[PDB]
């Protein structure tokens, strides 16, 4: 089987989760520790993943948000992400997949083009954000930013749905 869908089972009672997908184990751990500092009204359950497809586990909850932390200084984070978005459903792409390109502050030692992850996000209809997780002051701005996406994808506010998040995070160049 080894497939992923965002809607198979029950979420729970005021409990959401996040699937941190990446190749670096020390960089995504500091992002996972900084999300527990900013308190909220929901129980957070951070899942750490290496590469899709995942092994068949039966104790997994309903997944609300999958972020793909790619590295701009690494092609190994991009080639595993290209194998990761083959085994996904089209219902993930209605405002539940966010991208993170790390290494955007250093424009002297970068190892993939900025237009490549824009073209990866344009044909797959995903929002693209840039942040540097090596700075502890920049990481707390990022760890604030993962919570307020997760309040939308779990449905904790009235009136704003998951496809309302896709319409606010659009990106299109000017036709003139």
């Amino acid at each position: 089987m080894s497939v992923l869908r965002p809607l198979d089972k029950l979420p729970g009672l005021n409990t959401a989760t996040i699937l941190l997908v990446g190749t670096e184990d020390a960089l995504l751990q500091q992002l996972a520790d900084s999300m527990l500092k900013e308190d909220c009204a929901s129980e957070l359950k951070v899942h750490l993943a290496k590469s899709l497809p995942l092994p068949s586990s039966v104790n997994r909850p309903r997944i609300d948000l999958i972020v793909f932390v790619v590295n701009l200084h690494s092609k190994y984070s991009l080639q595993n992400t290209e194998e990761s978005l083959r085994h996904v459903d089209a219902s993930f792409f209605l405002g539940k997949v966010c991208f993170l390109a790390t290494g955007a502050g250093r424009e002297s030692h970068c190892s993939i083009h900025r237009h490549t992850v824009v073209k990866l996000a344009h044909t797959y209809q995903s929002p693209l954000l840039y942040c540097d997780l090596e700075v502890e002051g920049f990481r707390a701005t990022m760890a604030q930013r993962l919570v307020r996406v997760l309040q939308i994808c779990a449905g904790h506010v009235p009136g704003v749905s998951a496809l309302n998040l896709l319409s606010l995070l659009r990106s299109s160049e000017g036709p003139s």
């Binding site: 009672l13 005021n14 009204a41 779990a154 449905g155 904790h156 009235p158």
Partner: peptide, 13 residues
């Protein structure tokens, strides 16, 4: 205060 919990879980459901 349990009535805010009932209204918040009712709006979430």
């Amino acid at each position: 205060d349990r009535m805010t919990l009932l209204l918040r879980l009712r709006a979430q459901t």
